[PDB]
Amino acid sequence: KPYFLEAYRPIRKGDIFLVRGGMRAVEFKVVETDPSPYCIVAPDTVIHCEGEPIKREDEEESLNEVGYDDIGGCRKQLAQIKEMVELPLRHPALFKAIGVKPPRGILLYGPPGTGKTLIARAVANETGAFFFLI
Amino acid sequence: KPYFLEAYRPIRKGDIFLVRGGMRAVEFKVVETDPSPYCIVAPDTVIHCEGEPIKREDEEESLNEVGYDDIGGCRKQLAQIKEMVELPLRHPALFKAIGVKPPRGILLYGPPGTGKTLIARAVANETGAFFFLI
């Protein structure tokens, strides 16, 4: 109710709109909309208190995963990495269309607790590339 | 006799009131009280000489285990450890009820013969958590 209030948030059936409170981030999927396809939420809509844990479908990647929005203070090097390794993953057929040598090894050095593995996992999640840890 | 003397100690059947002397601490359990449930002790009560070793019940934890009363001179560090590890050990469900990171590793540095394992055992006995030694 606080979230929908003063908002008139548009919403389509199946959306995963997320709410935050009680220092926890819970996302509620709208399963059914009486009109279709989408609807505005109005304060005059009776509200429906069910609270059942329907398990998430396998195919979607949970919102639990990290992204570029979960890191701060390393914008310059983050942009460097993004521009360095954006083409070989989103455009490999290109790299087979041209004769050029891409990088095949990267080193990151800094004091511990600076967000290195976090950066690697964020980059992996944000391009769909398979991630392996050693 | 000297302990009940000048005392009128309140006493209920089954209590483990402890007596100390002869450079040893022995506790005598009252198994029978002629009136019930509790009573005061009086100098005019004849006394009974039995002195038989009935073995202690399994479920109760003996008085041999160390408590905070056995450690003095380290009040600050003991208070720090208590305030640090009271919640996770005695309120596990809460930490699942909120998103926060508890500590799962502690180091204690000091010269030998200062009572570090003593403190660990005292805390373990005072919170009822299982204790393992390596």
Ligand SMILES: Nc1ncnc2c1ncn2[C@@H]1O[C@H](COP(=O)(O)OP(=O)(O)O)[C@@H](O)[C@H]1O
């Ligand atoms: N740049 C950053 N922005 C936000 N959080 C960070 C950053 N760097 C480290 N952290 C925090 O550090 C934790 C992970 O540490 P990590 O980076 O794995 O250590 P290491 O640097 O040894 O790999 C995360 O919980 C994260 O919140």
Ligand SMILES: Nc1ncnc2c1ncn2[C@@H]1O[C@H](COP(=O)(O)OP(=O)(O)O)[C@@H](O)[C@H]1O
């Ligand atoms: N408050 C106290 N502080 C330090 N030592 C104590 C205290 N009370 C008793 N002791 C003594 O500490 C000894 C045990 O210390 P110990 O466990 O060997 O410490 P450490 O493991 O650090 O060497 C006992 O023999 C006991 O007499």
